[PDB]
Write an enzyme that holds these catalytic residues in place. Sequence first.
Site, PDB file in Angstrom:
ATOM      1  N   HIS A 107       8.213  10.804   8.173  1.00  0.00           N
ATOM      2  CA  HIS A 107       9.169  11.422   7.267  1.00  0.00           C
ATOM      3  C   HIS A 107      10.397  11.971   7.989  1.00  0.00           C
ATOM      4  O   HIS A 107      11.287  12.494   7.309  1.00  0.00           O
ATOM      5  CB  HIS A 107       8.494  12.483   6.409  1.00  0.00           C
ATOM      6  CG  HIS A 107       8.115  13.745   7.128  1.00  0.00           C
ATOM      7  ND1 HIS A 107       6.809  14.057   7.442  1.00  0.00           N
ATOM      8  CD2 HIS A 107       8.864  14.792   7.545  1.00  0.00           C
ATOM      9  CE1 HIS A 107       6.770  15.248   8.018  1.00  0.00           C
ATOM     10  NE2 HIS A 107       8.006  15.706   8.111  1.00  0.00           N
TER      11      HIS A 107
ATOM     12  N   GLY B  80       9.822  22.818  11.108  1.00  0.00           N
ATOM     13  CA  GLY B  80      10.075  22.190  12.379  1.00  0.00           C
ATOM     14  C   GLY B  80       8.840  21.939  13.207  1.00  0.00           C
ATOM     15  O   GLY B  80       8.966  21.430  14.321  1.00  0.00           O
TER      16      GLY B  80
ATOM     17  N   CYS C 293       6.390  19.816  12.417  1.00  0.00           N
ATOM     18  CA  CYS C 293       5.815  18.502  12.225  1.00  0.00           C
ATOM     19  C   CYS C 293       5.845  17.726  13.534  1.00  0.00           C
ATOM     20  O   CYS C 293       6.792  17.821  14.328  1.00  0.00           O
ATOM     21  CB  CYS C 293       6.557  17.782  11.080  1.00  0.00           C
ATOM     22  SG  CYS C 293       6.099  18.464   9.468  1.00  0.00           S
TER      23      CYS C 293
END
Lengths: 299, 300
Positions: B41, B143, B145
């Site tokens: 993503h 942030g 991920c």
Amino acid sequence: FRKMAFPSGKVEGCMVQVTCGTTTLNGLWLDDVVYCPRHVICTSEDMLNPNYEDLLIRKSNHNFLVQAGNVQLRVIGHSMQNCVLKLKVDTANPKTPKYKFVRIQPGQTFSVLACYNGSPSGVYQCAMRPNFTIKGSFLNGSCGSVGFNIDYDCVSFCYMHHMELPTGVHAGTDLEGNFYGPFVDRQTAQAAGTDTTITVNVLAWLYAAVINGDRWFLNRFTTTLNDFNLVAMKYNYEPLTQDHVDILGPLSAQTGIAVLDMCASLKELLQNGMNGRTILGSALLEDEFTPFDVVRQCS
Amino acid sequence: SGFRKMAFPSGKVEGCMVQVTCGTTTLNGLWLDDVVYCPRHVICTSEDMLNPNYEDLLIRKSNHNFLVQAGNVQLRVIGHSMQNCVLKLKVDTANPKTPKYKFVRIQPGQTFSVLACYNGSPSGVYQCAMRPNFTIKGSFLNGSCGSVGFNIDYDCVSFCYMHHMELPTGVHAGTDLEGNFYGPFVDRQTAQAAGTDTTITVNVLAWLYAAVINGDRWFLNRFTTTLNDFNLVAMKYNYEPLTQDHVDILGPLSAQTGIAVLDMCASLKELLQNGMNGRTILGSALLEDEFTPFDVVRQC
Ligand SMILES: *[C@@H](O)[C@H](C[C@@H]1CCNC1=O)NC(=O)[C@H](CC(C)C)NC(=O)OCC(C)(C)S(=O)(=O)c1ccccc1
């Protein structure tokens, strides 16, 4: 919320093992010095009551085996600073981080890298209790394991492990060898004083609950610091210092709730109890998260 | 000797963390050999996220649309592909600090360490269990991920988790390193709910034994229980049933303390029905279920 440790890799890169005879513990390899507990030089019969200065004079550089992994680091000098041994070695640690040696205050938290024979096993977070013990998890062979905080790129070393007490808590020194608390590095009978609750961290926890929208417990009143301190001591809470007031500064500004107003709200919880309610989903107040830990995990 | 929730030393994993930017999105990647893994993503915009056609969005991307940084250095992307929900970015360099590693899918009730990273920089480490409903109770902010979860046996890092999202209840969801989610979640910007969580019974039992081993035994009792009658009460309170394999796995703690597993089950059954009426175990007002039997043993 979670007990979160700092990443341990910068400290893993400094861990070695120090052996005298069969006595093997961990040491900390920074630049061309290895730091370790002086009792590595003790036999068992000598641990009962050692004369460390006499034991050291009988030592030469070539009686110390320092190993990183299975690679020997030659010792070229030795000295004693309080309860830590400093061993000059012939190789500067190429993994040496930016570092500092700091002496923390009770209530402050730090990560512990539990090590055995110079090999790290686990990392976890500890709070220095008001009675200068920590609730660790240390087995035989763990001495010389260190506690630290990381600020940007700089590792602040604050703890080196030396002992387990009867109550199952642990005790140790700063990296200058000075014990936290009244303890001594002898195998004699010792005991931690009665512990108290870390008020500044409880206050941080209340600030955390407020940031997260959980604020039933805020009242319309305030208090003096001395009034609150005199009351807190009756509930086995630590009195606040000016430094505690100051480190609650960021959370106070973040929420608009003056420190002394939060103290009045805590005083009411102490005096009236929770009356069945919860804060952050618990009937217990938490005292092992500092103001910094709270910021770290919320913002 | 004390009992503490302990994470693996994170150094071998710190040496693999990098920053990955596509467009206005920065998150973390895992750099092993000459491949950087990260959540796919990262390629989405605001509008994409609500129903992203990832195969479609990916084919419109160039290798030069991915900015990978390892500290002060940009790495050149020489190829990109996708495996389920993970993007793979071929780079011209091999990571020297690559540990011996494998990719594993963990079972619910198993534990792992999480290295929480922001902008490719390690920030904290902690221990998690894969919940029965395939969430994890982590601490992850914007942030995070691409942060990974792992175990270490010997000198081999087994990667089992990469972080993708937060649910509205505040728990977390993500994938294995093949990009397959744990649980019924999807990497689309929607509020998603998990199935009903349940408690990891064999882990609560391990923890109780740990509480004994460390000189705490108020919750004990002289009662006993069959396995099936314990399981009946457990299930009533939304605790997982205990298998004979769980019983076996608890042997060493049983042996070590001379408390039969089914005796510790009768203790737990009493706590479930009676509560802790004020008391605490190893500090906690609640029954902790994120220590496995192995975690307890290794630390005792
Ligand atoms: C590292 O050398 C080792 C780490 C210990 C071992 C188990 N868990 C730990 O944290 N430290 C020691 O063995 C100590 C060495 C001395 C020179 C300081 N010894 C130690 O901790 O002994 C405890 C005392 C001082 C004898 S005690 O606190 O009085 C005590 C008595 C009985 C039972 C427990 C504690």
